Amino acid sequence: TCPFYKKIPGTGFTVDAFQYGVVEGCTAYFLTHFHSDHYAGLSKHFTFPVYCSEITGNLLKNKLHVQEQYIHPLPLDTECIVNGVKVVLLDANHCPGAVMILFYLPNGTVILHTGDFRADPSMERSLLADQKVHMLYLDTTYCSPEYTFPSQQEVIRFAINTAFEAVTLNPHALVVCGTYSIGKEKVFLAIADVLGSKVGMSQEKYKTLQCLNIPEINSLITTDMCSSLVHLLPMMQINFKGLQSHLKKCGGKYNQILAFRPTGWTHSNKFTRIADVIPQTKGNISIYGIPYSEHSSYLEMKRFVQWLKPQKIIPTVNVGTWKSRSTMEKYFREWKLEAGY
Ligand code: NI
């Protein structure tokens, strides 16, 4: 049954709750972003309102085939009335189309649901700054002090450099980039731009990217693999048995694959910096794992929460075990005591 942490008190509203059938008393199902654990349940046979960003609506319509009439996109940063309740959608700094939602209840309570987010200082000067928020439904994916990671701009810098040097040394080298969902487009789009290439991909992956309101996208992606030296493949295929094979498929056109795997955190974050990363090499192929995150670091989350000073915090990730729940509450208390809310 729909968990309590996906229900907004004093509304007929639920958040990211599509896999429990008809939720009793739900007049509106919000969707924060197009990642499968969050949309699990939607199909062409959904006949209840869905409220989401414009980009998310393009993905619902074109990838899952939901019918134009049941998709209600809202603009960002704009006060909207939904079934007699004022809401606002804010950019979550997660994947394309991902939002946070602000709900202003008739009784005067104000609730922020983060969806999935990477907290940033720029959020402290958004519409959030204009009033008190009482309840915070929080993306706690990396809510532990070991989770440090660098800035996206640092990680993208590294990648642009590795690739440029490798291709300038060997003009017949391929850059491959691993993907499974939307997210992390900047990794591959940045490398393509330094190399003067479009990024080549399958027809389904091209389909996904054409929903995203990226400007000038027609100049940046293609379905013609042969014309292109940055390629996207499945992350299930980013390995030696899979790369070798893929290098065979190109028809004696490249003699070296340099590939990137953009992961959130892995335990080699604790001991090695970004400047001093190495790859795994079997022959002419080399695979690099890069810590590109679209979720808050521990410190990023902590700063945001200490600035917001909510009266109550409900975690939405890592809630399945008592040990995890207990561990997060301890951090929340630490934070509150240090700050004096
Ligand atoms: Ni997500």
Torsion of CA 232, 279, 256, 164, to 10 degrees: 70
Nearest-Å Rg of the Cα atoms of the chain is: 22
Q: How far is the CA of 318 from the centre of ligand 1 (A)?
A: 14
Of 300, 318, 331, nearest to 93 by C-alpha is: 300
Q: How far is the CA of 116 from the centre of ligand 1 (A)?
A: 5
The CATH number of 148-295 is 3.40.50.12650
Tell me, in angstroms, the distance from the centre of ligand 1 to residue 117's CA: 8
Beta-ladder partners of 291: 263
Cα 169 to middle of ligand 1, angstroms: 37
Q: Distance from the CA of 122 to the center of ligand 1, in angstroms?
A: 20
Which residue's structure tokens are 């199902």? 29
Report the C-alpha gap between 100 and 53 in whole angstroms.
10
Contact present, 223 and 200 (Cβ < 8 Å): yes
| Joined tokens for residue 77 | 């940063």
**3-state SS string over the chain?**
CCCHHHECCCCCEEECCCCCCCCCCCCEEECCCCCHHHHCCCCCCCCCCEEEEHHHHHHHHHHCCCCHHHEEEECCCCCEEECCEEEEEEECCCCCCCEEEEEECCCCCEEEECCCCCCCHHHHHCHHHHCCCCEEEECCCCCCCCCCCCCHHHHHHHHHHHHHHHHHHCCCEEEEEEECCCCCHHHHHHHHHHHCCCEECCHHHHHHHHCCCCCCHHHCEECCCCCCCEEEEECCCCCHHHHHHHHHHCCCCCCEEEEEEEECCCHHHCCCCCCCCCCEEECCEEEEEEECCCCCCHHHHHHHHHHHCCCEEEECCCCCCHHHHHHHHHHHHHHHHHHCC
Name the structure determination technique: X-ray
Spatial distance between the Cα atoms of 145 and 323, rounded to a whole number of angstroms: 16
Separation between Cα atoms, residue 287 and residue 265, nearest integer Å = 17
Written as one letter, the residue type at 144 is S
Measured in Å, residue 152 CA sits from the centre of ligand 1 at 16
Resolution in A: 1.8
The answer to whether residues 98 and 116 touch, using CB atoms and an 8 Å cutoff, is yes
Question: How far apart are the CA of 98 and the centre of ligand 1, in A?
Answer: 8
Distance 295 CA to ligand 1 centre (A): 8
Looking up tokens 């810098």 gives 157
Domain boundaries, the chain: 1-147+296-341, 148-295
Query: Rounded to an integer, what is the distance from CA 251 to the centroid of its chain?
Result: 35
Ligand 1 is a single-atom ion; what residues have CB below 5 A from it? 35, 116
Contact of 335 with 341, CB cutoff 8 Å: no
Q: What CA–CA distance (Å, rounded) separates 96 from 210? A: 12
CATH number of 1-147+296-341: 3.60.15.10
CA–CA gap between residue 332 and residue 257 (Å, rounded): 45
Cα distances from 235 to residues 4, 56, 298, in angstroms, run 34, 23, 26
Instruction: Tell me, in angstroms, the distance from the centre of ligand 1 to residue 261's CA.
Output: 17
Angle between helices 322-339 and 298-308 in degrees, nearest 10: 60
Cα of 181 vs centre of ligand 1, distance in Å, is: 9
Q: How many A from CA of 94 to the centre of ligand 1?
A: 7
How far does the centroid of ligand 1 lie from the alpha carbon of residue 35, in Å?
5
Measure 125 CA to ligand 1 centroid, in angstroms.
24
The distance of Cα 299 from the centroid of its chain, to the nearest Å, equals 18
Residue 77: CB atoms within 10 A of its CB come to 10
What is the Å distance from ligand 1's center to 167 Cα?
32
Cα-to-centroid distance, 293 and ligand 1 (Å): 11
C-beta of residue 50 within 8 angstroms of C-beta of residue 69: no
Residue 134 one-letter amino acid: H
CA of 100 to the centre of ligand 1 (A): 12
Q: Which candidate, 262, 188, 269, places its Cα nearest to that of 221?
A: 188
CA 83 to chain CA mean position, Å: 28
Read off the tokens for 270: 């604790």
Distance 20 CA to ligand 1 centre (A): 19
Integer angstrom CA distances of residue 304 from 32, 182, 238: 19, 25, 35
Half-sphere exposure of 153 (CA within 13 A, CB side): 0
